[PDB]
């Protein structure tokens, strides 16, 4: 799956979570988001073709995915506690990660 | 000044940026926030009062301030280039840094 497929999976499932009202719905959507984030985690965007792996910009780009995956994981644990509304609030806070990386790197 | 003082400074000046009557007040508020962030990085938050300086939690807490300072610096550069509306827009995005760290540790 390419970067665009992964990003639309992230986009759509954020809205599934908002639309949802039970724990299984939120868990399933976060699980889909986690897989999409992990899929996109390790590859290079266009605007960073000629960059070392440890260069500051690539470092921060990959750090963005790592941190998004951590907070998807944290939202998943709340869904697994049956804490639907907390997990929904955590998922909404994920939008910060989306915009931060986009403003840097897209 | 303690961590509560620093957070007041951050809260008041982030509002000042949103409400600034002139472009110069934006830069002044960013400058005060930068100092507040670096001071706060030297404190121990109450919810981590038992953790060693080497804990993963204290690491993420300190790192949040570095990243906040980095984006403050980006906004300062914009304000210093005369792109003060762009600086003000960037400053509004700093709220994500507040929300993220608070979700963990406030
Ligand atoms: C970097 C660390 C990113 C994070 C975190 C997120 N996104 Fe992203 N996204 C990124 C890039 C570099 C790109 C452009 C890729 C390209 O080749 O153009 C994108 C793109 C999108 C898109 C566009 C989809 C399309 O069909 O064009 C969307 C809808 C999108 N990203 C959404 C999105 C969401 C909802 C995120 C957080 C939950 C998110 N992205 C994180 C880089 C990064
Ligand atoms: C961690 C990396 C943080 C960042 C970035 C920001 N804040 Fe924060 N804030 C943090 C903690 C650990 C705490 C709890 C402090 C305590 O002693 O309990 C807070 C608290 C606040 C508060 C309340 C302060 C109080 O007197 O109780 C405010 C008003 C606040 N924080 C504001 C704020 C803003 C606007 C930030 C972004 C610009 C911001 N903080 C960043 C940790 C962190
Ligand atoms: Ni975090
Ligand atoms: Ni950044």
User: What lines the ligand 1 site, CB under 6 Å?
Assistant: A 3-4, 7-8, 10-11, 14, 45-46, 61, 64-65, 68, 94, 97-98, 101-102, 105-106
User: Taking the domains of chain B in order of start, what are their residue ranges?
Assistant: 1-106
Residue A32 CB burial class (10 angstroms; 0-12, 13-18, ≥19): middle
Three-state DSSP state, B16? helix
- Using alpha carbons, select from A63, A66, A48 the residue that is nearest to residue A106: A48
A33 annotated ligand binder: no
Instruction: Enter the resolution in angstroms.
Output: 1.6
Name the packing angle between helices A3-19 and A84-105 (round to 10°): 150
Write the CA distances from B40 to A88, B53, B60, B70, integer angstroms. Answer: 29, 14, 13, 15
CA–CA min distance B39, chain A (Å): 24
Looking at the CA of A29, which ligand is closest?
1
Residue A101's CB: how many other CB atoms inside 10 A?
18
Residues 6+ apart with CB under 8 A from A6: A36, A37, A39, A40
The answer to whether the CB atoms of B103 and A90 lie below 8 A apart is yes
């Amino acid at each position: 799956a390419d970067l665009e497929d992964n990003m639309e999976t992230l986009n759509d499932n954020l809205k599934v979570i908002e639309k949802a009202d039970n724990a299984a719905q939120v868990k399933d959507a976060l699980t889909k988001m986690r897989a999409a984030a992990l899929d996109a985690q390790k590859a290079t965007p266009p605007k960073l073709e000629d960059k070392s792996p440890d260069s500051p910009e690539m470092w921060h780009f990959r750090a963005g995915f790592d941190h998004l995956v951590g907070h998807i994981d944290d939202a998943l644990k709340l869904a697994n506690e049956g804490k639907v509304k907390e997990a929904q609030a955590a998922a909404e806070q994920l939008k910060c990660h989306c915009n931060h990386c986009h403003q840097h790197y897209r």
